[PDB]
Design a protein around this ligand. Structure first.
Ligand SMILES: O=C1Nc2c(ccc(Cl)c2Cl)/C1=N\O
Ligand SMILES: [Ca+2]
Ligand SMILES: [Ca+2]
Ligand SMILES: [Ca+2]
Ligand SMILES: [Ca+2]
Ligand SMILES: [Ca+2]
Ligand SMILES: [Ca+2]
Ligand SMILES: [Ca+2]
Ligand SMILES: [Ca+2]
Ligand SMILES: [K+]
Ligand SMILES: [K+]
Lengths: 360, 146, 360, 360, 360, 146, 146, 146
C-alpha cells in the first residue's frame, strides 16, 4: 500500500511548491507600483534607482516560471502514480501542453529592463498586464486547507459523490461568514481600481485626474449616484468606469439580501409569540364580553324606571361594545386558525398515533 | 311572499349549490363536503351543531323555507344575534345550557368596573324568571334585548 | 323578511347617488384646467369668458354638496333598517358627524368668483386643492360591481368569514390583470404630475418651466436617471420631484417582480422535460460504453501484434473515454435522484398503498 | 427565598437609574445646537451667553459620569446575588473593566469651557463627538419593556430555550408594525444628517452650503437620483454623502419588500376565489356546447335543402364554435388540477380516513 | 393513412419557404445601413453608387413579398388536410385575411428609388422602419427545431396537454442556457440602438452627435448612472433614451436574480456539512468539560493549604469555563434540532415503518 | 403501407416507450406506471376507459396496428373528434350512453338563443334513427358530421 | 413567606398555565400537551425525567410548593446547577448513575492538558467518599461546589 | 506496514465513525443508519450488495484489514475500477453475471462505428477463455486491463 504514502508525499510537496510561487508574484506586483510612482514624482535624477527597480522585477520573474514548471511536473507524476503507468509519454493529454504554455506566457509579462516623466504605451500595457497573476490564489488556497487530506471527509463524501473542488471550498468559506467577505471585496475593489483609473489618465500640468479625485469618482459610479462633477477624459477610463458600474450593480443585491435575511424570526420564537398572543386575546375577549353584558342590564334598569336620556346613552354604548367584541373575536379566531395549520399541533399527534398503531 | 321573482330565483340558485343531489333537503354529508372543498375539516359534532342551529321543525334536514330565513341574516353586515349568542359561551363555564351564580359573580364583579355582591344577586334574581339559580339562554336573550 | 325587500332598494338608490356624484366632480376638475390655460395663453383681453368659467364651477359644486349630503342620508336609514331601530337620534355616532363635516369641507374648495396673466397664491392653492376629489372613485366602484348583491358570494363567504370590503375587490382587480393596471397607472401619473409641476414654476419672460420640459424631466426623475440638464427652481417644485421619485422606487420593483414571474415553468411541463432528459442521458451512456470497450479491444490487438505507437494512441484514447463515461454517469445520477424525489413517485405509491390498506 | 426579592429590588433600582441617565444626555446634546447656532447668528455681541451654555454642558455631564458608575456598580451587585458570592474581588473580570473605562471616556467628551464666528478646528470634532451618546437607548428600552419580569413568560421561554437580549425585543418591535419604524427612521436620518453636513460646509462670504441646500441635497443622494446642481466641497463633507447613500441602498429595499408583501392574498380567500371561478367555468362550457350543437343542426337542415351559401356560413361558424369550446374546456381542466391539488381535499379526506382507521 | 405523409411533406416544404424568407430581410437591412453610411460619408461624388444600393432593396423586397405570399398557401393547405375539407373557400377566416394584409404592408416599406449628406425627412422614417422585419425570427426558429416532428414528444405531451408553441420553446431555450442569452441580448441592444440614436441626431457643421458619443451615452443610461456630460438634443432621441432605460431596469434585475440563484447550495452537500459540523461540536463539548472539572479540582486543592490568591484565580477560571461551556452546548442543541428537522431520520423511519405495515 | 421506413422506425421507437416489457402489447399496468412517472395518479376505471377507447378487436390489449391509428390523430393540432365526444358528456345527464328528450330540451331551449318545444321535438325525431326516445352516440356523431 | 402579594399572584397565574384542569397538581399529560403546543414532541421517558427532576416528596405530581422552588432558578441568567449536571452526562459513559476510573482517566489524562495516572487515582480516591470505585452524583456535585 | 502512525490513527478514527458500537466489525444496520443520517433510504438488497462488494473473507462483516484496502481507493480522484465495473452493468441485459453474444452484437455492431459479425464473433471467442458462450466478469476485467 505504498500508493497512499506516495500520494501524501507528493501532495505535501505540491502544498509548498504552490505556496512559494505566490510570494514571488506578490513581490513582482509590489515592485511595480513603487517604480511607477517614483518615475512620476521623480524624473531624470533617479536613473540608476529606476534601473535597479526595473532589474529586480526581472530577476524575480525567472523563478516563478521554474516554480510553475516544477508544480506541473509534480502534478503529472501524481497522475502517473494514481493510474499506475510507467512511461510519462502517455500521461500527458492534448490540453496540458496548452495550459502550461498559456500559464508560462501569462506569468512572463513584465517591463523588460532594455532601456519627461511618463510611461510609453508598451510599458504601460505591460505594467498593467501584471495584475493577471491573481489566478494563483485559488490554487494556493485549496491545497493549504486541510479538506483533501482528511480521512473522514473523503469517506463521507464517497457515499454522496460530492467531489471536493474549488467551488465547494468557496461555498463553505462564503457560508461561514458572508458579511466579512463582502466588506473585504468591496474595500479591495474600491482601492485596486482607483489606481488603474489614476494611471490611465494622469495629467502633467493642472492634473485633472489623480489619486485625489479617483477615490471620489469610483464609489459614486459604484453606487450609481453619478453626480457629474468629474468625468473620464480618455478612452481607457470609460471601460474601467463601465466595469466598476457593472460590478456594483451585481454586488449591491447580495448585501441587500443578507441584511434582509438577518432580521427574520427563528423557528423557536414564533411558537412562543403565538402562545402568548393567545393568552392576550383571550383576556381581551373576556374583558369586552363583561362590558357587553353589564351595559344591557344598565339600559334595562334605567329604562324600566322611566327616564329617556340615560336609556339613549346606554343603548348607544351597547352597539359600540358589540362592535369591539366582534372585532376581538374575529382576530382571535384568525390567530387560532393560523396556529392550527402552521405549528401543526395535530400533525404530531397523528404521527404518534400512526406509530402506535404500527407498533401494535 | 313580499319578494320578487328575481330574488327568489337567486336564492334558489344559491340553495342548489348545497342541495346538489336534488332531494330537496340538506343533510350532514353535503355540508361536510362543501366545507371540505372550502378548506376546513369539520367534525361530526360541529356539523350537527351547525345544521341544528337553523332548523325549526326538528326533522334533521333543512329546506328552502328554513333556508331563506337563515339567508335573511347573513346578508347584513352589522349582526346583533351571533354577537349576542357568542357572549353566552364566554360566560358559560358551567358546561351545560345554563349560567350559575358563581360564574357571573367571578366574571363580572372582577372584570371591568368592579361590581358588588348585592348587585350581582339582584341581577341574577331579575334574570331568573322561573326563580331557579341557573339562567337559561331564553332569559339571557330576553334580558339583552329588553 | 321585509328587510330583504327594503335593503335591495336602498342599496340601488345609494349606487345611483354615488355614481351621479362623480360626473359633477369630473366636470368641476375639467373646468379648471381650461380656465388656467385660458388665463395663461390669453390675458386681460378675455374677461367675460373667464368670469363664466369661474362662475360655472360653483353651480357644479352646489349640486355635488347636495348629492354628498343625500348619499350620507342613506347609510343612516340602512343602519336603522339593519338594527330595527325607530329613532334616528340613536343611529348616529360621534365619528360619523366628523366624517360628514370633513367630506363637506374637502369637497367644497374651489376658486370663488368674487373677483398680467398669473395666479395668486390663494387662487393657485385653491385650484390645486381640487385634485383631492379622487377619494370618490373607490366608493363609486365598490357599489357598482356586482359582488355585494349576489346570493352565492355572501353564502360562501359566511362559512369562511371574508367580509367583502374595498380591499378584497382591490386585490381581486390587482390579481386579475397584474400588468394592465401598472401600465395604466404609470402613464396616468406621468401626465397628471407633469401639469402640477408645470403650474408651479411657469416663467413669463422666457419659456423655462412650461409643459415642454416637465414631460422630459418627470420620467427621468421617475426612473432615477437624473441627468441635470433641467432642475426645479422653487420650493414648491422641489417636493413634487421627491414624491415622484418615492413612487417610482416602489413601482419599478412591483413591475420587475411580475416580469420575472411571467417566465417561470408551470407544474405540468417540468415533468415532461425530465422524462425526455432521462431518455437522452440513457442513450448517451449506451453510446459511450461501446467506445470504451472497443478502444480496449483495439489496444489489446495492437499490443498482441507487437506495435508501440498504436498501443500508445489506444491507451490515450481509452483514458479519455473513461473520463467521458464517468462525467455522463454522474450527470445522469443526479437527474434520476430528482425524478425519484421531485415528482414524488414513491410518495404517490405510498399514498396508494395506504389507501388500499385502509380499504382492506 | 430572599433571592427572588433581592433580584426584583435591584432590577427596579437599575431600571430607574438607566432611565434617569438618558435625560441628562438628551439635555447635553440639546445644549450644543443652541450654542453653535447662537455663535453663527452672533459673535462678539453674545459673549456671556456663549459662556453660560458652555459651562452648563459640563455640569450636565458631571452627573452622567456618576450615573454610569452607579449603574455599573448595581449590575455587579446583582451578579453577586445571582451566583451567591461574598467577596466582590471575584465577580470582576478584565473585559468588564475595559467596558467601564470605554464608557467613561466616550460619555465624557464635550466642549471644555476653558476659553469671527466660526467653530475653531479642535472643538468642532468634540461637539460632533457628542452624537455617540445614542448607545444608551437600547439599554434604557430593554429594562422598561417589561418582558424580563413576567412570571408566565420566563417558563414558556425556558421550555423552548430562548434567551431575552437586545435582539429579541428589537425583532418583536420590528414585526409588530414594520411600516411605522421605517417611516419614523427615514424622517429622522434625513434631518439629523442635514445638520452634520451643514456644520462642515458653513460659508461666510456666500451661501455655498447651509441648511437651505443640504435639505435638498441629502434626499437626492439618499434616493440615488444625484442631479449635480449642488455638490460637496470639503473632505469632511464627501464622506457623509457616501454614508447616506450606503444607508439608502438598504432602506429602499427594506421598504419595497414590505410594500410588495402587503398586497398578496392570504389563505382564507384563495379557496373562495377558486370555488367561484369553477362555478363560472362549469356554466361557460354549457353555454358553448349548446351553440356548437345548434349550429351543427342548422348546417344539416340547410344543406338538406340544397342551399349554396347557408351551409358554408354554418360550417364556418361551427369551425370557430369548436375552437371556443376547446379553449374553455382546457381552462377548466387546468383549474381543476389546482382545486384538487392546492387545497388538497383528497389529502385531507385520506388523513381523516387514516385517523379513523387508527382509532378503530 | 396518407394524411401523415401529406402533413410531413407540407411541414418540410413550409420550413424551407420560411427559412429562405430571412436571408432576404437580412440583405435588405444590410444594404440600407450601407447606403446610409455611404450617403453620410459621401455626397455628389458617389452620385451613381447610391442608385444601385437604392435599387437592389426593391428586388429584395419583391422577392420577400413573393415568399410571404407563398408561405400562407401551405398553411391553408395544411388546415384543409387536417380537417378533410375539399373547398378552400371555407378555410379562410376573417382574421387571417387581416393578418396576411398586415404582413404584406409591414414587410413592404423601403426607400423607393424614385429620386446634401443629410437624410431628408420622409425617407429616414422608411429607412428606420425596416427594423420591423425581426418578427420573422420566431416563425423560422420554431419550425427548424425538431420538436414538432418528433414521434415521442407528441405522444408524451398528449397525456399532459402541453400543446407545443412558441412560448414552450422559448422557455426551454431560456432554461437550458440562462447565462449566455442575457449577455447576447445586452451586447446586441447596446449596439443596435447606438446607431438609431446616431441617425436621430447627427450634426453636420460640428461633429457633436455621431457614433463616437452614443456608444458612451447608451450604456450610461442603461445602467442608470446618468452623468450629464452628453445629453440628447432632439425630440426623437429622448424617446430612444427612455426606451433604453425601461429595458435596462428589467434586464439588470433578471441578471442579478440569475447570479444570486447560481451560488446557492444543493441538497447533496448540506447533509454532509451538517454531519461534519456535528462531529466537531461533539468534540468541542468534550474538550470544555474536562477543563471545567480540572479547574474545579485545582480550586478544591488550593483551599486546605491556606492560600488566597491561588483560590481566587481558580474560582475565576472556573466561572469563565462554566460560562464558555454553555454556548457550545446551546449551539450543539440547535444543530441537533436542525438536523432532526426537514431531513428527519425519524421521518424516514416512520415512512419505512408505514411501508412495512402496509406490506404486512 | 404508404409510410416510409423512417416514419415506421420513429413510431416503433415511440411504441417501445410504452411496451417496455417487450411482450408486444400494452396493458393497464404499463400505462399506469407511465402516468405515475408523469405525475398523475389515475384510477382503475380511468385507466380501463383510456385503454378501451382505442382498441378495436376487443382483446383488452393494444398493439402496433391499433396504436398507429391513434398516433395518426394526436399529431394534428385542430382535432374534430375529441371536441365532438366531449360535447356528448356535457349533455349526458342521463348517466348512460344515451340522450333523453328532457336533457336536450332544458339544455338547448334555454341556453344561448331560446329554442321551441316543436323544434326540440323535431330535432329529437330526426336524431332518433331507430325511433327510440333515447339518442345513442352513433346518431349524435352522424348528425354533427353530416 | 418573604415574598409580597403581587409576586405570589404572578407565580400562581404562571402555575395556572400548566394546571389547567384545576386539580392542583401537574401530571405528565398536561406538560406533554403544553410541549406539543410549543412545537416539540417529547417521549414518555423524557417527560417522566423532566417531571421527576423537580419533585421532592416523590408522589409523582408537582404542586405550588415544589413549583416555586423551580421557578426561583429559571429567572436568573447565569445558572450554576444545570451547567454542573450537564458536565455529568458527558463524562458518564458507564450508563448508570456513577463514574468509573477508566472514564475519568481517558477523558482527563488525554483532553486539554495531559494529566497523570497518579493524579487521576488521587482525584478518584478523594471523590470516592464511601471508598467505592464508582463516583455518585452527590460526590461529584460536592467536589465541584467545594 | 509502510504507513506511519498518524495515517493509521486517522484511518482508525474514520473507521470509528462506522463502527460506533465498538464490536470491531461493520454490519448492515450501522451502514444503513449512517446512510439514513446522510439523507438516503437504502433497501436491504442495496445494503447487502454494498457490504459484500468489499469483504474478501466472506464472513459477512467488514473489519480494519478489509477497510483500509477500500479506503486506499476512494482517496484518488481518477478511478479506473468503478468506471470499469459500471461498463459491465450497461451491457449486462442477460440479468445474470454473464454477457451473451446477442447483447454484445446488438450493442456494439450498431452503436458508435458499426462493427461486423465476424469481428464480434472473434471478440467473443477471445474473451471466452473457458470457451463458453457467456462471458464472466473476470474475463471482462482481464480483457480491459490487458
Ligand atoms: O464509501 C463507502 N464506505 C463503505 C462502503 C461500503 C461498505 C462499508 Cl462498511 C463502508 Cl464504510 C462504501 N461504498 O463502497
Ligand atoms: Ca340533499
Ligand atoms: Ca327542517
Ligand atoms: Ca407490455
Ligand atoms: Ca387489440
Ligand atoms: Ca393538573
Ligand atoms: Ca410532589
Ligand atoms: Ca459494529
Ligand atoms: Ca470480513
Ligand atoms: K442614478
Ligand atoms: K447627474
Amino acid at each position: 500500500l505504498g500508493a497512499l504514502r506516495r500520494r501524501k508525499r507528493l501532495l505535501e510537496q505540491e502544498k509548498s511548491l504552490a505556496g512559494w510561487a505566490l510570494v514571488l508574484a506578490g513581490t513582482g506586483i509590489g515592485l511595480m507600483v513603487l517604480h511607477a510612482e517614483m518615475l512620476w514624482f521623480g524624473g531624470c535624477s533617479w536613473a540608476l534607482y529606476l534601473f535597479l527597480v526595473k532589474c529586480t522585477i526581472s530577476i524575480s520573474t525567472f523563478l516563478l516560471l521554474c516554480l510553475i514548471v516544477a508544480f506541473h511536473a509534480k502534478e503529472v507524476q501524481l497522475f502517473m502514480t494514481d493510474n499506475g503507468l510507467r512511461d510519462w509519454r502517455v500521461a500527458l493529454t492534448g490540453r496540458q501542453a496548452a495550459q502550461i504554455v498559456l500559464e508560462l506566457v501569462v506569468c512572463g509579462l513584465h517591463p523588460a529592463p532594455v532601456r519627461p516623466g511618463f510611461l510609453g504605451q508598451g510599458e504601460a500595457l505591460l505594467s498593467l498586464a501584471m495584475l493577471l497573476r491573481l489566478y494563483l490564489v485559488p490554487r494556493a488556497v485549496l491545497l493549504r486547507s486541510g479538506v483533501l487530506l482528511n480521512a473522514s471527509y473523503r469517506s463521507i463524501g464517497a457515499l454522496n459523490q460530492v467531489r471536493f473542488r474549488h467551488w465547494f471550498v468557496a461555498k463553505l468559506y462564503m457560508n461561514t461568514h458572508p458579511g466579512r467577505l463582502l466588506l473585504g471585496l468591496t474595500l479591495g475593489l474600491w482601492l485596486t481600481t482607483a489606481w488603474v483609473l489614476s494611471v490611465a489618465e494622469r495629467q502633467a500640468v493642472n492634473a485633472t485626474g489623480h489619486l485625489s479625485d479617483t477615490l471620489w469618482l469610483i464609489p459614486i459610479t459604484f453606487l450609481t449616484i453619478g453626480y457629474g462633477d468629474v468625468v473620464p477624459g480618455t478612452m481607457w477610463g470609460k471601460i474601467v468606469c463601465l466595469c466598476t458600474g457593472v460590478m456594483g450593480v451585481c454586488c449591491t443585491a447580495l448585501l441587500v439580501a443578507v441584511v434582509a435575511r438577518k432580521l427574520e424570526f427563528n423557528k423557536a420564537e414564533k411558537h412562543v409569540h403565538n402562545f402568548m398572543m393567545d393568552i392576550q386575546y383571550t383576556k381581551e375577549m373576556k374583558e369586552s364580553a363583561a362590558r357587553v353584558l353589564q351595559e344591557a342590564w344598565m339600559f334595562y334598569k334605567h329604562t324600566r324606571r322611566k327616564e329617556s336620556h340615560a336609556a339613549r346613552r346606554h343603548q348607544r354604548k351597547l352597539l359600540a361594545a358589540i362592535n369591539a367584541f366582534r372585532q376581538v373575536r374575529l382576530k382571535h379566531r384568525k390567530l387560532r386558525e393560523q396556529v392550527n395549520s402552521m405549528v401543526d399541533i395535530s400533525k404530531m399527534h397523528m404521527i404518534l398515533y400512526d406509530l402506535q398503531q404500527n407498533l401494535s | 311572499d313580499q319578494l320578487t321573482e328575481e330574488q327568489i330565483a337567486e336564492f334558489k340558485e344559491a340553495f342548489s349549490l348545497f342541495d346538489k343531489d336534488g332531494d330537496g333537503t340538506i343533510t350532514t354529508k353535503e355540508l361536510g363536503t362543501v366545507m371540505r372543498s372550502l378548506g376546513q375539516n369539520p367534525t361530526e359534532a360541529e356539523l350537527q351543531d351547525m345544521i341544528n342551529e337553523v332548523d325549526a321543525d326538528g326533522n334533521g334536514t333543512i329546506d328552502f323555507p328554513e333556508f331563506l330565513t337563515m339567508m335573511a341574516r347573513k346578508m347584513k353586515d352589522t349582526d346583533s344575534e351571533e354577537e349576542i349568542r357568542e357572549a353566552f359561551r364566554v360566560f358559560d363555564k358551567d358546561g351545560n345550557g345554563y349560567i350559575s351564580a358563581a360564574e357571573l359573580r367571578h366574571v363580572m364583579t372582577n372584570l371591568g368596573e368592579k361590581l358588588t355582591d348585592e348587585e350581582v344577586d339582584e341581577m341574577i334574581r331579575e334574570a331568573d324568571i322561573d326563580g331557579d339559580g341557573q339562567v337559561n339562554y331564553e332569559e339571557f336573550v330576553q334580558m339583552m334585548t329588553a
